[PDB]
């Protein structure tokens, strides 16, 4: 009668599994319990296991625009993320270029690492005249700062126009 | 005894630059990397026991735009599986593969893999090595860039 | 006993769409499809007997113009040979291959094949599966899209 | 007995032209070319002894500009590994590989390699042959263009 | 003394081959004749055979512009053809775009399925002003139908020109 | 006590190696010395050896712009070279197009086979107005030959200009 986790049955006897960070070197015999040895350098196992050998940490390949956010250890996996301007895509297993928001749209802030840009339409009093994956909607120019008057109002795609009277 | 090796690229020590080199750094005992009754030494897989082996290699090339423009967009990505011995100074190619490619700056990422495999007569003391064309384009993943051998039968 | 499997794509049941999927339908006993002392169940090739196996896969992609424009002409055609067990929930990749491609609407037909192969230690209850990038581009031919395994030696 | 063959292209006798042909000239006993307990005759590798064999082929294509413009720059480079018998007149394909390519006159040299491999049941008297799409593009090198077979187990 | 067809020799005795639709399960022994079993689903053999196993029907892949003209059965192979506008090419083993006939040429009719267009020069009184793999030569316009007279005669590449007098 | 070259030790005895052109068919036994047999057709070995078999001569593939300069034999390897206008490149293992010298530069002569063009700047009194991998700097035109006078002097990139007076 073995506990489903932390224990395993073999040769009709209850045997203890290996703790995370260790692998099963050899199964329990009639004379002894399991032999569990620590994972090698850059190797790991994150669960209570019965594994033949340990897993090798993935490479956060800079050549793939990847960088480590969590380095991992004998107990935990290494975690990678696409560097700025890119997001992970699980179809290509690659770091894809972030979506650009059209004019009249801005990038939702704050900008998430490893996640694609979300585009929102600019609100009244704000505009965007560019395709950009980073830029939010900027506010219309206030003509008084320029010492001028508002000639015509801006849109969500273009800025206000200022003119000097006489 | 029935010897074998499955060797995966040593991500810690891939050569830089874009001239063809002899790859001398591979894992032998971590992840899927394993070796029995063959030795890996001085960057070479050394045959210990006479026999007919099946030899294979999978080589992956990649480039992302954050690494900057390629020297040229016209590439020839190649692998050469070569044989020498501790005795003779020269080496000779057993298998060969690859493709010319055009990797435009328009796309942000490029990828290509070569696989070769073959059945060869090998003697104790003979040494297998991998040569590749663009070291700095190599994919450091253990499931991507590897080579191996396993004895199938005796010489007799 | 010396187990083996040669599995060919189940033309009757290839997934649609263009997101990466795990291929779970293969013939096991018709044409060149064969299996002995391994089992194919729940879309997985299950190892029955401990040993070192050579694993291989050939995957073919194709597109004809009568199927209409591609979603994009910039493709990354990939195969991933992965391993899991009836025990552990997660899976890990053993071999990997493919190429980025540009398939222009100018030409009426396009074709590309990937081949990977490797020598791996396998235990009873471990399960091999094939993942591919563009299911709807798969060539349904038995000589085109297949994977297999054969035991070469005991663990000892 | 445990039969095998490693056959390399007969550089002396590669067919010309650009229509798909059956390749019938290969070295059997020079360089890496070797054969034991199988026979090569009438352009075919003949199985002598029943068994499950692993079959493989590496095919390389090349073109240099000094050979003049290609008929078309739109190519489909293919290999077909086919099986027939001294009995039956027709033949059937076991494995298949290749890629459509665009080989522009802008670049002076082009290269591409195909590799296929598979595990097949074979009977005494069955005959393996290689078919390729562009004979005149074949790389004559022994490490480039070859195919082979080795018995892995008995039928039982 | 065995008949070359329908019979085969083994162990110095004459044994009957398997009929189409069946494969040789096991060769004749000293105690019995050949054991022949029916082909599995979607499998076939079309001859009197001694085969280890049956052949699998080819796939008429719509993805290759292929369609079945004959579905096949346990006795006969499946037959495929390139769909309209395409023909089979044995170099690419693919469905190639049909040849277009230039202006001054028309497509020979009736148009064959799975076979490439044949181009014939247009006969006097007929013309073709297009590249087309389907179009035959059309006859010159007769100006009387338009209530007009023939200004100048057409060619094999261009149509007649009609004009209204006064 | 064996001589490092021309001799090898086996079974604790000194055995003679095979001469170039021959391979080691079988090692020395307790009863006999080495058995050395001649290399097969188109095969070779260039050293005093202990080799299992002979090496096959490389192919000077015309399809790679290669040609033999030395055909080789059972004793020596075959030697290939890139044909005119090309040089060997060890990164592509291919025959690359020779570098063109810009205007103001000429190709160093004599031109080496299988070796890339070297470019030198044109000397005073000489010029080059083309990109060419073969052309050296040509000398300025002498106007007297044309029955004319020198209007303006040439450069290293352009020719002299001749004019007729009156
Ligand atoms: Cl990890
Ligand atoms: Cl990764
Ligand atoms: Cl995306
Ligand atoms: Cl290691
Ligand atoms: Cl490719
Ligand atoms: Cl190319
Ligand atoms: Cl793109
Ligand atoms: Cl060999
Ligand atoms: Cl089945
Ligand atoms: Cl690409
Ligand atoms: Cl085309
Ligand atoms: Cl493994
Ligand atoms: Cl030969
Ligand atoms: Cl293509
Ligand atoms: Cl170029
Ligand atoms: Cl089979
Ligand atoms: Cl059929
Ligand atoms: Cl087909
Ligand atoms: Cl055609
Ligand atoms: Cl040589
Ligand atoms: Cl060469
Ligand atoms: Cl160069
Ligand atoms: Na924007
Ligand atoms: Na026409
Ligand atoms: Na010049």
Numbering used by the authors:
A (entry chain R), E (entry chain R), F (entry chain R): 34 to 199
B (entry chain A), C (entry chain A), D (entry chain A): 162 to 317
How is this structure described in the published paper?
RANKL is a member of the tumor necrosis factor (TNF) cytokine family and was cloned by four different groups. The functional receptor for RANKL, RANK, is a member of the TNF receptor (TNFR) family. When interaction with the ligands, three separated RANK extracellular regions bind along the clefts formed between neighboring monomers of a RANKL homotrimer, leading to the assembly of three RANK cytoplasmic regions.
A crystal of mRANK/mRANKL was crushed and seeded into a solution containing purified mRANK and hRANKL and crystals were obtained. The 90% identity of RANKL ectodomain (residues 162–317 of hRANKL and residues 161–316 of mRANKL) between Homo sapiens and Mus musculus indicates, there is no significant structural difference between the hRANKL-mRANK and mRANKL-mRANK complexes. The critical residues in mRANKL involved in the mRANKL-mRANK interactions such as His-179, Lys-180, Gly-191, Arg-222, Glu-225, Asn-266, Glu-268, Lys-281, Arg-283, Asp-299 and Asp-301 are all conserved in hRANKL and make similar interactions to mRANK. For the hRANKL-mRANK complex, the corresponding residues (Arg-223 and Asp-300) in hRANKL form similar salt bridges with Asp-94 and Lys-97 in mRANK, indicating its important role in hRANKL-mRANK interaction. Considering the important roles of Arg223 and Asp300, a set of hRANKL mutants, including Arg223Ala (223 M), Asp300Ala (300 M) and Arg223Ala plus Asp300Ala (223 + 300 M) were generated to screen for hRANKL mutants that lack osteoclast-stimulating activity. Biacore analyses showed that hRANKL has a comparable binding affinity for mRANK (Kd 1.56 × 10−10 M) to mRANKL (Kd of 6.8 × 10−11 M). Mutants 223 M and 300 M exhibited 20-fold and 70-fold decreased affinity mRANK while the double mutant 223 + 300 M exhibited a larger, 260-fold, decrease in Kd.
